[PDB]
């Protein structure tokens, strides 16, 4: 079935091999689906990013088409740009925008964001999601690792490898997909679910930005899932430090019943987001400036 699956991808990717125009591949990170490198475009000296995914090593091979569906149809300015895809041996390579400021993860684990900064991240994420959700796309992997920055503090949504579509014909999804600590309780419970799962996962990312880590992070993933499934919504460890406006915002995200949870469109009008600073306000958080 692997040689079968390569042949299918071949019909959907761009022809050729980007090794013919890229130099100096350097691995800068990874996920479960594969690795991410920086590369230099030989003729110009421009930097790009390259995601490499081994076809043999996927939980669910069929998700790899997500990368092609989003790249073909669902582009926006708070979303990382995908340029080309190739089949290189047994790997799918995706050549994409290089976000040189790195991932929000490096920030939330090494410094404290203030609320102007938190609100700017949430605004940017929510702008991306309102548009995605309007077109039936659920990201399903919202967390700090999926949010990338430029050198000038602009915020983009990345890693659509786990996304799915919904429609009049297919209004809810059923698959168990995401990162344990960030999964919505309805998704852990295997209830059919929609875009609302991204809003819950966003709330967990707000807890990352306040506390440094998602709830139950000190537990094995399976156990954390049970606790999310069965308990009241998790609390901030640093609850005392946050403003009533941040807490009111967070209470609209971390609502167990998905029909009571706010939508991205609604959230863009919340007063908490009035505190959002410009991209400039994010710049000092980055490793290269700290």
């Amino acid at each position: 079935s692997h040689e079968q699956f390569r042949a299918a991808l071949q019909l959907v990717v761009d022809p050729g091999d980007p090794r013919s125009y890229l130099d100096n591949f350097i691995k800068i990170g990874e996920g479960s689906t594969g690795i991410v490198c920086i590369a230099t475009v030989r003729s110009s000296g421009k930097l790009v990013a390259v995601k490499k995914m081994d076809l043999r090593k996927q939980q669910r091979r069929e998700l790899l088409f997500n990368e092609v569906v989003i790249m073909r149809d669902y582009q926006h300015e708070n979303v990382v740009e995908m340029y080309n895809s190739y089949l290189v041996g047994d790997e799918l390579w995706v050549v994409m925008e290089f976000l040189e400021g790195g991932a929000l993860t490096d920030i939330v684990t090494h410094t404290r964001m203030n609320e102007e900064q938190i609100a700017a991240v949430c605004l940017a994420v929510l702008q991306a999601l309102s548009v995605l959700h309007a077109q039936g796309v659920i990201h399903r992997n919202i967390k700090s690792d999926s949010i990338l920055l430029t050198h000038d503090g602009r915020v983009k949504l990345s890693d659509f490898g786990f996304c799915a579509q919904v429609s009049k014909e297919v209004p809810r999804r059923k698959e168990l997909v995401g990162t344990p600590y960030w999964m919505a309780p309805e998704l852990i419970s295997r209830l059919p679910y929609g875009p609302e799962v991204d809003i819950w996962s966003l709330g967990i990312m707000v807890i990352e930005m306040v506390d440094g880590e998602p709830p139950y992070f000190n537990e094995p993933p399976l156990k954390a899932m049970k606790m999310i499934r069965d308990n009241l919504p998790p609390r901030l460890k640093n609850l005392h430090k946050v403003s009533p406006s941040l807490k009111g915002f967070l209470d609209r995200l971390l609502v167990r019943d998905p029909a009571q949870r706010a939508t991205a469109a609604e959230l863009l009008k919340h007063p908490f987001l009035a505190k959002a600073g410009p991209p400039a306000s994010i710049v000092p958080l980055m490793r290269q400036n700290r």
């Binding site: 479960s32 689906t33 939980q59 993860t105 786990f162 997909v177 990162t179 344990p180 000190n218 993933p221």
Partner: peptide, 6 residues
Amino acid sequence: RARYEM
């Protein structure tokens, strides 16, 4: 403390 997907 695993950040990997499922």
